[PDB]
Structures are given as C-alpha cells and as structure tokens.
Design a protein around this nucleic acid. Structure first.
Length: 50
DNA sequence: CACGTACGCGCTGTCCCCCGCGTTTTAACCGCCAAGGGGATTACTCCCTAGTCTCCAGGCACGTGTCAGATATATACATCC
C-alpha cells in the first residue's frame, strides 16, 4: 500500500485484475455522476455519499 | 419370397446456450440466550370392553318348480301379375 501507482488504461496494458478496475470505474463513476446529475437527489443524500 | 420405399443413420452447417473463470455478496454454520411446552420413561389405579363359553336360529348355499318376457312358427286377410 506504499507502491500505489496513479495509472491509466493505456498505461496498464493487460494485467490480472482488469475486471476489478472495470467494476470500479463502472459502478463508482456511473452511480456518482447519476446521483450528481439527477434532479430528485436531495442535499442529505449528497452529503451522506460525500 | 419378391419388390419397393420410408426411415435410420451419416455428414455438414449454424447458432445458441451452457461452461469456465473471475469478482462480489450473503447466508449457512457454529456458538449463544430465554422461557416454555411435548414427549419418553416409571409407577400406580381403575374400569370398560373384548375374549370365552353355551345355546340357538336364520342366512347362505344348493336344488328345483314355475313364471313372465323374448323368440319362432300357424293360419287368415289384403294385394300384385
């Protein structure tokens, strides 16, 4: 946990655990921009997710 | 036994759905109360009811005579050539 690297999809290539990165990107980015861009999301929901 | 033709089987394509693998969840499992009821035994008491016995009588089985419905003729009236 000290050799953690700031990487990119083109900077990785093909290593084991790419499905974990895909699940991370899909779930977190899609749900975070969905809860950010929705009009029915209150301030309480946005502060508990933050 | 002869004929003939329909179908079992082999081959090929194709597409689809199940299998293998990785990742994430989730509930099975084990260990815990908290009290209470169900049920397996041990012992005891009581009483109802089914076995046992005796005697008898009618239900069942067999046999036989009849009897009413179904079937097959006997004779008479109507009818075609």
């Amino acid at each position: 946990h000290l050799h953690n690297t700031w990487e990119t999809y083109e900077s990785i290539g093909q290593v084991r655990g790419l499905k974990r990165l895909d699940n991370y990107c899909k779930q977190f980015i899609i749900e975070d921009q969905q809860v950010r861009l929705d009009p029915y999301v209150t301030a309480e929901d946005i502060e508990i997710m933050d």
